[PDB]
């Protein structure tokens, strides 16, 4: 992995956030170009 990109990123983010949900008031260049730890993955999600 370490790229968790495309149609896989949404599934991964839902699997890591099946209960609390995401946020609304960057995903690609942070999570697709390079490695992408669980830290920013939850940072995105509430």
């Amino acid at each position: 992995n370490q790229h968790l990109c495309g149609s896989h990123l949404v599934e991964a983010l839902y699997l890591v956030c099946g209960e609390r949900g995401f946020f609304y008031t960057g995903i690609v260049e942070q999570c697709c170009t390079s490695i992408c730890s669980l830290y920013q993955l939850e940072n995105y999600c509430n």
Partner: protein, 506 residues
């Protein structure tokens, strides 16, 4: 060794006709300029016309060659302006200089030149420097060489090799670029290769005379479970039994703006189709050189479907037609780039969407022979002979049927035994002679002549011969008569019997 001296010290080859002049030359005195830009099937005639060359005197210059098997030594007593012995310029389509697992080149004097060769990967250039011996004598345009090419750097491995008489099933490890969207699919190149010396670039001309058939395969459904990663594969059909094929695959990948994702290629592999039944052996011709000897010859089946072992033969005695035993014969009478742009468009739309939405906080077995001789045959009898080709001792092909009639025996129809005659009171002469023990006698001819009179002929059929136990002449004039008898057979007429004399009383 045929040495050809070029005029004015240099010869330019810009066409097949120009290359025809150096046909059969092995040492060329002068220098060569090769700038072929178009033509149909250029590789084969260029090989036939210039391949025999072994030593070149001047400099070898590839230039604007948009569209060398025995060369090993380049002396370069003459060097190009700037003292280069190799000048490779403006080679758009050049992908392989030589096959370097086999080919050797030697350079004596001069330098090298590699500028504007988009599909000449640099590895080939350094390997040229190694084999030539020019290392340290330099010339190589790093930006304009190998820049527009698929410089793959990953090796693929197959897993599930299967076989069939008309199928090969293949599977291989799935591969993914760092960003999995870039992978567009897999191509498989397969061709019929009698031997194991086939290069990937054989039979690749710009005009579409491709020798490696292309199969495009989509990526497999990428599963999150590593234990459920399906092996991409492809089954090919309509293949020829026991024919050596060459198979390898190469991956297609988009071009990242930041880091080059080269992809992967698979080493060329060789597969053998499973052997099956062969076809009917061609040209069965059966002849007879004797009354008891028949020779059969045949041609091998067109498709051996494997290594032939032996032929299965059966011959049968055929009875004569029943109608012959009853008849009385005495009676008278661009797409790639458009798809790349489309894929990039889909990828960039998805990227923009993601950035916007997310916000952080009897039988015989002939072996090794194509002819047979069979004895133990009755004289002048037809034989029905069959022939089945077998490539394994069982699996034999359908039989091939041929008929051969044995030669007749010369003295078999001859009437053996003297002719006996009986005289009755009514001037009727009864003639009796012994029937021969070729095939079936059809009739007999009885010729009797009175002394001083013309010959008289009578036909005695086998019906008459059996019924009367010979023949009966009636109404003869008194006198002395000489009679001769001849037997008629299927093969031909027999020999006339010795004359017999009988007298009719007045």
């Amino acid at each position: 060794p045929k040495v050809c001296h070029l005029l004015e010290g240099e010869k330019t080859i810009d066409s097949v006709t120009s290359a025809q002049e150096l046909r059969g030359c092995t040492v060329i005195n002068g220098s060569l300029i090769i700038n072929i830009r178009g033509g149909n099937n250029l590789a084969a005639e260029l090989e036939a016309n210039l391949g025999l060359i072994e030593e070149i005197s001047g400099y070898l210059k590839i230039r604007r060659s948009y569209a060398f098997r025995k060369l090993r030594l380049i002396r370069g007593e003459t060097l190009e302006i700037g003292n280069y012995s190799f000048y490779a310029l403006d080679n758009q389509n050049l992908r392989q200089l030589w096959d370097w697992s086999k080919h050797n080149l030697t350079i004596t004097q001069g330098k090298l030149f590699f500028h504007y060769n988009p599909k000449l990967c640099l590895s080939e250039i350094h390997k040229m420097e190694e084999v030539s011996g020019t290392k340290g004598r330099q010339d190589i345009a790093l930006k304009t060489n190998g820049d527009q090419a698929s410089c793959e750097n990953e090796l693929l491995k197959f897993s599930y090799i299967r076989t069939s008489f008309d199928k090969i099933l293949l599977r291989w490890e799935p591969y993914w670029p760092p960003d999995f969207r870039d992978l567009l699919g897999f191509m498989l190149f397969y061709k019929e290769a009698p031997y194991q010396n086939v290069t990937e670039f054989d039979g690749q001309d710009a005009c579409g005379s491709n020798s490696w058939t292309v199969v495009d395969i989509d990526p497999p459904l990428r599963s999150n479970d590593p234990k459920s990663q399906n092996h991409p594969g492809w089954l090919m059909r309509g293949l020829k039994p026991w024919t050596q094929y060459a198979i390898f695959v190469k991956t297609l990948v988009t071009f990242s703006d930041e880091r080059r994702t080269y992809g992967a290629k698979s080493d060329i592999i060789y597969v053998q189709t499973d052997a099956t039944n062969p076809s009917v052996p061609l040209d069965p011709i059966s002849v007879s050189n004797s009354s008891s000897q028949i020779i059969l010859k045949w041609k091998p089946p067109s498709d051996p479907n494997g290594n032939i072992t032996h032929y299965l033969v059966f011959w049968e005695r055929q009875a004569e037609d029943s109608e012959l035993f009853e008849l009385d014969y005495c009676l008278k009478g661009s797409q790639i780039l458009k798809e790349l742009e489309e894929s990039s468009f889909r990828k960039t739309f998805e990227d923009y969407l993601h950035n916007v939405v997310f916000v952080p906080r009897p039988f015989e077995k002939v072996v090794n022979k194509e002819s047979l001789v069979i004895s133990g045959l009755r004289h002048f009898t037809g034989y029905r002979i069959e022939l089945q080709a077998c490539n394994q001792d069982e699996r034999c092909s359908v039989a091939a049927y041929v008929s051969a009639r044995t030669m007749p025996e010369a003295k078999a129809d001859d009437i053996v035994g003297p002719v006996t005659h009986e005289i009755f009171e009514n001037n009727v002469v009864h003639l009796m002679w012994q029937e021969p023990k070729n095939g079936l006698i059809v009739l007999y001819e009885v010729s009797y002549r009175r002394y001083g009179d013309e010959e008289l002929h009578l036909c005695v059929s086998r019906k008459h011969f059996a019924l009367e136990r010979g023949c009966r002449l009636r109404g003869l004039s008194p006198g002395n008569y000489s009679v001769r008898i001849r037997a008629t057979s299927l093969a031909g007429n027999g020999s006339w019997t010795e004359p017999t004399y009988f007298y009719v009383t007045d």
